[PDB]
RNA sequence: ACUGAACUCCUCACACCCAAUUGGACCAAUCUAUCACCCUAUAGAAGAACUAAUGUUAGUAUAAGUAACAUGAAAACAUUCU
């Protein structure tokens, strides 16, 4: 409706000519889902292309530095320290985390790791990305926390801060190659279907139906 | 000061509201059914009533005749009063017509109601429906009404 | 809230309690009619300076009369249709100059008074008075 | 004619706070059964209104593009027929309308 | 003003007077610049006559912060937690010593409007005075026009 | 002691829900479909036992919280307050319906089973009372009835009428204190443990658990007080507008046990009476119901 | 725009002040205020209380246990005053109760004892601790201090005051600044009785007397609104007390209390306390 | 210009204890240059003070003043933002703490009289603000009867005391 | 015989009640010079201080939500009618 409504006003502009360039630091979307199950030489050659991009990196230190990132970035969520949240989360990672927790807090522990994070997958960028290119890895994590969320006036909405709740999550990191300064950052989630449904909230909940516009059906 | 005056000042003058209500009435005739500000209807309504007892004699009383000519200014519906509404009422005597308010017009905030024929053939109004038998207290008043008859 | 009793009931019982009320307003009026058959207070002749109770009346109109003289004279009529006494009262408990009586009018719909009032008029037996 | 000492807040405010210049609130308003609106007692549910006035709009529409100009109003009764309707032995002879939609309930 | 100002009755703290009185002055501040020619009175002050006044009032306490500023202060926190600062800005050696004397003179609560300039807690002797105690009695106690 | 007779039987059955919503489990969700010709095609997320219905009318609107008196759960009647226990469809139900003779009996039951409350808690401490129950009757009855049965010494003397008086100012003042229907499903042998001193209320559970197949029971509380009841009953005393009692009867087995029932007449808000139509419907209830 | 800071300054002085009336922060301790110095203030307050005695058991009396747990808590993330408080309190009791019988003979064991409990109550000790300016100085873990804490700082420092000075010198203390406390509050504000008649009846039953009759000695506006009685208590045709009273029962309960008042020697027109 | 009323709604209260009172929530939230007037927007705001969200609703269905239809489709923004982004679990359950209005940015033209002589005519602008409260309403405070004034009346002539003496 | 003042006494301290006019001791805020630096000092200078001019400009009140203003009727909003 924009370019319609743009046009019966009269406000006709023409296209944003200037040399510049809009920078991002973080492709949208994914490459490639790893679809889980009920419960490769493409990884190997994606790796090749990392080492080669960036020498100094190693597979197997991967999972201990990506489950300190996830601690450290939910005990951020806590603290309210949103600078170094963004210089550890991508822009797309930022908004789906950090928008619907404002006017409210949030409590989340991390108690320990049953399972070890453990690597699945790892996906290349084709160079075809404004002339850059960016790296995806996959972690499967299975670990015991706390969760508990406080409204604006400090009520629970759901959880419990002493009783934790097994979880299995499948986290999905990225980094940018081009640059040297990028670091790898969580970028989205698979929530595969499979998977059961979370607590609900102690709360009940209504919705509102078909609104009959002035004539039945 | 008025006391007993059952007209009641409308427009401009007497020829305004009898000019303003014969309009109402040929608006009103082919519909079988208009709305318009409270004080007109109630006003309409009894000149509708005395209009149909007087047509009830048929077209071939002149007088009759030229009263509806004078009535109505589309010169078309009073042959469909004579041959339609007249066999409707045959049987009727009173209460020719139902009045009801209905919320107010938008921009005056004025007191409106609509006023129709009764027996039309258009769907019907959401009338106020008087309460239902099978309440508590309707049921009790057949139980002693029973009971009365019962006793004599 | 404030309602009334004509919309909480259905229209074959409404006809029913008109009459019914209305043939209680009768009996009651018919069972009145005779004071004497009731014990009546103690009778006393007019003594001087003694007074009269008054009563209520009904307006209808107005129509001519004319004398022996043969001269016009307009005269009002009054009509009575009950008339009934309401209630008594002692020159002391009063505090007056003199005692009072209470005189009632035309009979009206019992819905439409006070519940006070409609205990009055029960436990006097009389129907209401406007 | 003209004031002298202009008026305080005080006596502003007692007059244009005192009861009558107020609004009274009603105690007159219920929930209508069938569309489950409020309405007030002695008035019609808007909403039913409107519904039926629209209907009454679109009758009215057809029956003119029937008529097909003004000064035709015919001298006989008239009946509308929804679809999955057939004319009835009564109103054989009287006119009929066609509307292109399913019977309502609530309508005969 | 009276009715603008608040007020208060006559009274003392913790009955001071009965028992071993003490001087409800617990702890000044004083708050003088080196430079500064309104703090010259204030250097001179407490470079001669602060040590003399500390000597015969042990029981107060002194703090002396010594900083850079415009105007110079005193601040005067006595028992009950009342605090009350007073600028010495431009101020004579004898004025401040006569200030300071009625700082450690004062009690701990405002000035205000007294109301009275007594306060009696037990103000009665030969009982307070009521309706009857200046009229006799009667036999039986009857009052007046009663025959039993 | 009679007063502590009471007071046990509220523990006991304060004890008894307590087990029954610890039992059911937590967090536990469920989906109801809204019925009827007013705002339909609605699903309200709840809980299988802390919600109710009440619950659902304040999520819906105050019209509903303040107008309803019960509700049908897939066409069966059901407790305002009572929580629902499954997904299901729900409706409504006013004293302005169609057919309301459900509510109607709803409203009988709740005011014969707040005369027996307040006939119960009226009598002399040092008397006793041996109530049986609350009987069914039809709407055109006239009256709720509540039967009982008392001491031997009081046979021959009947309630008078500023006993009919302060009987029916105990009510108006209960009706102003407002307390809810705290409702209940019992098992036979809890209620049997609860009413276990009546044999009157003994013999009239075990008939209520062999009409039963299970033998679950209702329970319904007022505060203090306790009874049982056939069918489902209306959430705030405060909806009976006006209350009283309209005289006594004594049923000819009388050697055997007497058998006393006191009649009552009222009715709400939704629909109040006028003075005389309402003493003509008192002077109707002071007839003896032959049921 | 007017050229010019000296009015800004000022208006942003008053501005702040604004502020900090509208929303003021919450109260905390002189201690870590600033211009504090904690030996030269115990030193100081020794001085100022007339008093010269150890430091080492001035601050075991001061300190508590809840402040010794947090330092230590915060240490890992010394002598409490309890023994002191245990004394002062004991010697306290014992000096109080010894010149309140020396005072008042008739006074019974209960009563004195009741007497003394509230003079050592929380609310007293803690309202005169606090003009006597020990809240600060004494150490704890919450804020504001709570007052049986408070209580035990305060006669923690009294069984210091015992056992480095003296008894006598206790004594004096004391003596003048609970009794001071006391002058106001008479005996039935302090200590509460209930069915006083019964009192006063057991009471001269013990002393041997007949048991007396309560007569309304005079009355007005027995019908008014504002009924008032005054009640004779006479024992054998001899009167001992009188009452004024709303109502017959107010008039006589007054005058038991009066009467009790002059036989355990509490008067309000009593000797003064000697200093 | 002010605009704290939004900002209002932006306070965040710490976690709660479980041990402790319920706090109900508050809400607030207002329209911005209305055309209408301050005399009698004042007037609906008072009616609809005190009372529940429902009953609002209908009073200002059924009132026949302008401004009645702003203040609706108002408290209709405000319940559906209430129960969608603050936590509000009964849409029903709320009631008016205060509404209010306020002047706003409102502009002049000239009225032309007889003889040459004009006058400023001010159009006039108002903002709405409207605070709402989950919980039931307070119930309205009772008159006090004859027992409250003869209860206050005696502790008068109780705490009243002899005057400029000792 | 008493009551009865800013008179007089009484405890303390005192320059602290007249129009026009005249003589004196201080001072607010500002710029400059030099100090000082949570707002001050010593000197000079001056567009140097407003409860009042049917005072000027801007805003907002009272009068006042008052005086005053406006859309012919019905309906498919196509048309028709007065
Ligand atoms: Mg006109
Ligand atoms: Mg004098
Ligand atoms: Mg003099
Ligand atoms: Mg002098
Ligand atoms: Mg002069
Ligand atoms: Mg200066
Ligand atoms: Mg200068
Ligand atoms: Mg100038
Ligand atoms: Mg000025
Ligand atoms: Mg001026
Ligand atoms: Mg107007
Ligand atoms: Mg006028
Ligand atoms: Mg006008
Ligand atoms: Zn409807």
């Known amino acids: 409706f924009a370019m319609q409504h743009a046009r019966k006003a009269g406000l006709v502009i023409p296209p944003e000519k200037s040399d510049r360039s809009i920078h991002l630091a973080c492709t949208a979307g994914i490459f490639d889902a790893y679809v889980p199950p009920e419960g490769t030489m493409a990884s190997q050659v994606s790796i090749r292309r990392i080492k080669d991009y960036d020498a100094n990196f190693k597979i197997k230190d991967f999972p201990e530095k990506?489950?300190?990132?996830?601690?450290?970035?939910?005990?951020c969520l806590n603290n309210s320290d949103h600078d170094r949240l963004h210089t550890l989360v991508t822009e797309h990672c930022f908004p789906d985390m950090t928008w619907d927790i404002k006017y409210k807090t949030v409590r989340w522990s991390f108690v320990e790791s049953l399972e070890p994070s453990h690597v699945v997958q790892v996906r290349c960028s084709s160079m075809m990305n404004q002339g850059n290119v960016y790296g995806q890895i996959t972690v499967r994590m299975h670990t015991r926390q706390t969760l508990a969320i406080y409204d604006r006036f400090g009520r629970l909405m759901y959880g419990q801060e002493d009783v934790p709740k097994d979880v299995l999550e499948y986290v999905v990191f990225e980094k940018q190659l081009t640059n040297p300064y990028g670091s790898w950052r969580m970028h989205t989630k698979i929530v595969p279907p499979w998977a059961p449904p979370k607590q609900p909230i102690l709360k009940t909940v209504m919705i509102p139906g078909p609104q009959l516009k002035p004539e039945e059906e | 000061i008025s006391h007993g005056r059952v007209f009641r000042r409308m427009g401009l003058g007497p020829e305004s509201r009898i000019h303003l209500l014969r309009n109402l009435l040929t608006g009103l005739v082919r519909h079988e059914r208009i709305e318009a500000p409270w004080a007109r209807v109630d006003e309409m309504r009894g000149y509708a009533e005395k209009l149909i007892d007087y047509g009830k004699l048929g077209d071939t009383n002149e007088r009759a005749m030229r009263m509806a000519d004078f009535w109505l200014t589309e010169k078309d519906l009073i042959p469909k009063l004579f041959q339609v509404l007249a066999p409707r009422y045959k049987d009727q005597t009173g209460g020719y017509t139902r009045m009801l308010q209905i919320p107010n017009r938008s921009l005056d905030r004025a007191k409106m109601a609509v006023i129709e024929y009764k027996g039309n053939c258009l769907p019907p109004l959401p009338l106020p429906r008087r309460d239902s038998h099978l309440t508590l207290l309707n049921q009790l008043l057949q139980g002693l009404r029973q009971d009365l008859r019962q006793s004599q | 809230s404030g309602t009334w009793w004509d919309e909480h009931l259905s229209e074959e019982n409404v006809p029913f309690i008109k009459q019914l009320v209305s043939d209680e307003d009768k009996a009651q009026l018919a069972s009145k009619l005779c004071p004497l058959k009731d014990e009546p207070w103690p009778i006393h002749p007019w003594e001087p300076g003694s007074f009269r109770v008054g009563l209520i009346a009904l307006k209808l109109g107005m129509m001519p009369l004319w004398t022996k003289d043969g001269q016009k004279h307009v005269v009002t009529l009054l009509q009575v249709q009950d008339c009934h006494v309401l209630k008594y009262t002692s020159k002391e408990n009063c505090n007056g100059k003199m005692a009072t009586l209470s005189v009632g009018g035309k009979t009206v719909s019992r819905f439409r008074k006070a519940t006070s009032i409609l205990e009055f008029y029960r436990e006097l037996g009389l129907p209401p008075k406007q | 004619?003209?004031?002298?000492?202009?008026?305080?807040?005080?006596?502003?405010?007692?007059?244009?706070?005192?009861?009558?210049?107020?609004?009274?609130?009603?105690?007159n308003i219920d929930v209508?059964?069938?569309?489950?609106?409020?309405?007030?007692?002695?008035?019609?549910?808007?909403?039913?209104?409107?519904?039926?006035?629209?209907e009454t709009a679109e009758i009215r529409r057809q029956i003119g593009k029937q008529e097909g100009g003004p000064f035709k109003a015919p001298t006989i009764e008239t009946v509308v027929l929804y679809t999955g309707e057939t004319p009835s032995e009564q109103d054989q002879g009287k006119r009929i309308i066609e509307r292109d939609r399913k019977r309502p309930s609530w309508f005969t | 003003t009276a009715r603008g100002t608040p007020s208060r009755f006559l009274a003392s703290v913790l009955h001071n007077g009965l028992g071993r009185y003490v001087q409800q002055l617990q702890r000044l501040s004083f708050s003088v610049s080196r430079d500064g020619a309104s703090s010259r009175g204030a250097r001179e002050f407490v470079e001669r006559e602060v040590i003399d006044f500390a000597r015969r009032n042990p029981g107060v306490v002194i703090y002396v912060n010594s900083r850079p500023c415009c105007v110079p202060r005193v601040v005067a926190e006595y028992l009950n937690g009342a605090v009350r600062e007073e600028s010495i800005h431009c101020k004579s050696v004898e004025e401040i010593s006569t200030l300071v004397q009625k700082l450690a003179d004062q009690s701990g609560?405002?000035?205000?409007?007294?109301?009275?300039?007594?306060?009696?807690?037990?103000?009665?002797?030969?009982?307070?005075?009521?309706?009857?105690?200046?009229?006799?009695?009667?036999?039986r106690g009857l009052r007046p026009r009663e025959v039993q | 002691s009679p007063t502590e007779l009471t007071e046990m039987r509220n523990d006991l059955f304060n004890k008894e829900k307590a087990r029954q919503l610890s039992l059911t489990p937590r967090t536990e969700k469920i989906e109801v479909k809204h019925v009827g010709k007013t705002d339909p095609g609605t699903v309200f997320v709840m809980n299988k036992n802390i919600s109710t219905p009440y619950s659902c009318a304040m999520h819906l609107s105050e019209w509903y919280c303040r107008k309803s008196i019960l509700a049908l759960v897939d066409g069966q009647p059901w407790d305002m307050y009572k929580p629902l226990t499954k997904s299901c469809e729900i409706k409504f139900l006013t004293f302005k319906d169609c057919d309301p003779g459900e509510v109607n009996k709803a409203y009988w039951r709740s005011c014969a089973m707040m005369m027996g409350c307040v006939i119960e808690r009226a009598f002399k401490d040092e008397y006793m009372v041996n109530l049986v129950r609350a009987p069914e009757v039809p709407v055109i009855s006239g009256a709720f009835?509540?039967?009982?049965?008392?001491?031997?010494?009081?046979?021959?003397?009947?309630?008078?009428?500023?006993?009919?008086?302060?009987?029916?100012?105990?009510?108006?003042?209960?009706?102003?204190?407002?307390?809810?229907?705290?409702?209940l499903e019992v098992e036979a042998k809890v209620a049997l443990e609860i009413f276990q001193h009546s044999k009157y209320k003994v013999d009239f559970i075990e008939e209520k658990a062999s009409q039963n197949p299970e033998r679950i029971v209702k329970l319904?509380?007022?505060?203090?007080?306790?009874?049982?009841?056939?069918?489902?009953?209306?959430?705030?005393?405060?909806?009976?507008?006006q209350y009283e009692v309209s005289a006594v009867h004594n049923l000819q087995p009388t050697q055997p046990s007497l058998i006393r029932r006191f009649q009552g007449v009222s009715l709400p808000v939704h629909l109040r009476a006028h003075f005389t139509i309402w003493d003509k419907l008192l002077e109707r209830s002071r007839k003896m119901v032959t049921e | 725009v007017k050229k010019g800071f000296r009015a800004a300054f000022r208006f942003q002085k008053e501005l702040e002040r604004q502020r900090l009336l509208r929303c003021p922060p919450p109260p905390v301790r002189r201690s870590e205020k600033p211009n504090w110095d904690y030996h030269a203030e115990i030193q100081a307050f020794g001085h100022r209380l007339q008093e010269n005695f150890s430091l080492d058991l001035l601050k075991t009396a001061f300190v508590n246990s809840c402040y010794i747990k947090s330092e230590e808590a915060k240490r890992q993330q010394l002598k409490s005053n309890q023994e002191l408080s245990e004394q002062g309190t004991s010697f306290s009791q014992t000096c109080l109760t010894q010149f309140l019988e020396d005072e008042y003979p008739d006074m019974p064991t209960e009563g004195i004892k009741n007497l003394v409990d509230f003079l050592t109550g929380e609310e007293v000790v803690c309202h005169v601790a606090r003009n006597l300016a020990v809240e600060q100085l004494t150490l704890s873990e919450e804020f504001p201090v709570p007052p049986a804490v408070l209580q035990q700082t305060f006669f923690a420092v009294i069984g210091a005051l015992l056992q480095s000075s003296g008894p006598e010198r206790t004594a004096l203390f004391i003596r003048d600044f609970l009794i001071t406390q006391m002058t106001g509050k008479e005996l039935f504000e302090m200590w509460k009785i209930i069915?006083?008649?019964?009192?006063?009846?057991?009471?001269?039953?013990?002393?041997?007397?007949?048991?007396p009759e309560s007569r309304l000695t005079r009355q007005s506006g027995g019908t008014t609104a504002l009924p008032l009685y005054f009640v004779g208590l006479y024992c054998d045709k001899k009167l001992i007390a009188e009452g004024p009273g709303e109502t017959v029962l107010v008039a006589e309960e007054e005058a038991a209390r009066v009467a009790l008042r002059k036989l355990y020697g509490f008067t309000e027109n009593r000797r003064p306390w000697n200093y | 210009?002010?605009?704290?009323?939004?900002?209002?709604?932006?306070?965040?209260?710490?976690?709660?204890?479980?041990?402790?009172?319920?706090?109900?929530?508050?809400?607030?939230?207002?329209?911005?240059?209305?055309?209408?007037?301050?005399?009698?927007?004042?007037?609906?705001?008072?009616?609809?003070?005190?009372?529940?969200?429902?009953?609002?609703?209908?009073?200002?269905?059924?009132?026949?003043?302008?401004?009645?239809?702003?203040?609706?489709?108002?408290?209709?923004?405000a319940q559906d933002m209430a129960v969608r982004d603050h936590n509000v679990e009964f849409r029903s359950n709320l009631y008016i703490a205060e509404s209010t209005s306020g002047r706003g940015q409102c502009l002049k033209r000239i009225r032309y009289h007889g003889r040459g002589r004009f006058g400023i005519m001010e159009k006039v602008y108002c903002h709405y603000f409207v605070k709402l409260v989950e919980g039931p309403p307070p119930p309205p405070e009772p008159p006090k009867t004859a027992v409250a004034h003869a209860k206050e009346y005696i502790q008068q002539l109780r705490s009243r005391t002899i005057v400029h003496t000792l």
């Open chain 4, 1 to 27: 004619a003209a004031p002298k000492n202009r008026r305080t807040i005080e006596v502003n405010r007692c007059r244009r706070r005192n009861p009558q210049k107020l609004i009274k609130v009603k105690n």
């Open chain 6, 220 to 241: 319904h509380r007022i505060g203090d007080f306790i009874d049982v009841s056939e069918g489902p009953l209306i959430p705030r005393t405060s909806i009976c507008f």
């Open chain 1, 66 to 75: 990506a489950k300190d990132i996830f601690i450290e970035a939910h005990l």
């Open chain 6, 145 to 183: 009835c509540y039967d009982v049965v008392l001491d031997s010494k009081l046979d021959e003397w009947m309630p008078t009428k500023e006993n009919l008086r302060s009987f029916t100012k105990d009510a108006h003042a209960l009706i102003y204190k407002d307390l809810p229907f705290e409702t």
């Open chain 7, 195 to 211: 069915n006083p008649m019964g009192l006063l009846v057991e009471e001269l039953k013990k002393r041997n007397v007949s048991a």
């Open chain 4, 32 to 54: 209508c059964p069938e569309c489950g609106h409020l309405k007030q007692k002695h008035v019609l549910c808007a909403y039913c209104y409107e519904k039926v006035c629209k």
């Open chain 5, 109 to 139: 609560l405002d000035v205000i409007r007294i109301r009275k300039p007594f306060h009696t807690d037990n103000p009665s002797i030969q009982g307070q005075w009521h309706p009857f105690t200046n009229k006799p009695t009667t036999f």
């Open chain 8, 1 to 77: 210009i002010s605009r704290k009323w939004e900002k209002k709604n932006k306070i965040v209260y710490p976690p709660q204890l479980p041990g402790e009172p319920r706090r109900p929530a508050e809400i607030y939230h207002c329209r911005r240059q209305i055309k209408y007037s301050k005399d009698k927007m004042w007037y609906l705001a008072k009616l609809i003070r005190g009372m529940s969200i429902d009953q609002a609703l209908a009073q200002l269905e059924f009132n026949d003043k302008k401004g009645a239809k702003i203040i609706k489709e108002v408290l209709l923004e």
